[PDB]
Design a binder for this molecule. Structure first.
Ligand SMILES: [Zn+2]
Ligand SMILES: [Zn+2]
Ligand SMILES: [Zn+2]
Ligand SMILES: [Zn+2]
Ligand SMILES: [Zn+2]
Ligand SMILES: [Zn+2]
Ligand SMILES: [Zn+2]
Ligand SMILES: [Zn+2]
Ligand SMILES: [Zn+2]
Ligand SMILES: [Zn+2]
Lengths: 157, 157
């Protein structure tokens, strides 16, 4: 449940959860000196037993504590946007704000329930969709771009 | 009250105590995310009051938490022996066991408490010391080396 992104430079060994093999998310530390994602290690105690997965030492959830130093460094490492095309890095904490605007991202066109790229998403909807709502100039009824001719033969004018 | 030693790979800011400017000793972490020596932050609290130095965020002693991940990192860092003349590098874990047997540590002479390197004491006792005991063939009574001249000119034979 770690951050599934491509860090730049690649994520260092000490900033990786041994459970999900990804960057620590809401980092917590065990008394035996090991870092895990909070939900990763709580589930491990809740599923695999009240132990530490690595060293088999007994692990207390209430003796766990938030490693807010590990968390701080990870959220400022330069990450690549997982969506296609982006080549400018950013601090991982801002990746949440980027994906509410990402122009390289991929979002759907509900006129036909289908994705595009954000620089092309609105470009297709208005001149490219075979299912785009283009009404007949005489009947004023919305029908597909690929269905514009078939109406005109039996079009109530 | 921190680790006073010269690290073979230069010490990184992540392992520095912002109080004593030295490598963390028994590293503990604050709820705000800043590492300190266990002694330093306890000293900084029970001498000033309940605070974190750098950020001034609320901090109690029972709210402290050992950072053994940082501690295990620090004890595996290569260091050089602080004793002058010693040229053997080692991981910080073994530094103490070397420092109690190191030839280049200063030792006090058992006659005049003059300071010498530990290996040199074996020589200074038998050849260089002025207070080393010597026996006179006529009397063979224990006496200081510097006192052999005033004794050989009046020896009762
Ligand atoms: Zn562990
Ligand atoms: Zn994890
Ligand atoms: Zn992007
Ligand atoms: Zn479309
Ligand atoms: Zn029509
Ligand atoms: Zn702090
Ligand atoms: Zn310190
Ligand atoms: Zn030494
Ligand atoms: Zn002496
Ligand atoms: Zn004599």
């Amino acid at each position: 449940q770690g951050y599934d992104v491509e860090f730049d430079p690649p994520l260092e060994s000490k900033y990786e959860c041994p459970i999900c093999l990804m960057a620590l998310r809401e980092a917590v530390q065990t008394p035996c000196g090991h870092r895990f994602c909070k939900a990763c290690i709580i589930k491990s105690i809740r599923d695999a037993g009240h132990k530490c997965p690595v060293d088999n030492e007994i692990l207390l959830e209430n003796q766990l504590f938030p490693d807010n130093f590990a968390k701080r460094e990870i959220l400022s490492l330069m990450v690549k946007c997982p969506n296609e095309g982006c080549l400018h890095k950013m601090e991982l904490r801002h990746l949440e704000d980027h994906q509410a605007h990402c122009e390289f991202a991929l979002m759907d066109c509900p006129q036909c329930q289908r994705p595009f790229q954000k620089f092309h998403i609105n470009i297709h909807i208005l001149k490219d969709c075979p299912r785009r709502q283009v009404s007949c100039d005489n009947c004023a009824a919305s029908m597909a771009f690929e269905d514009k001719e078939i109406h005109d033969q039996n079009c109530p004018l």
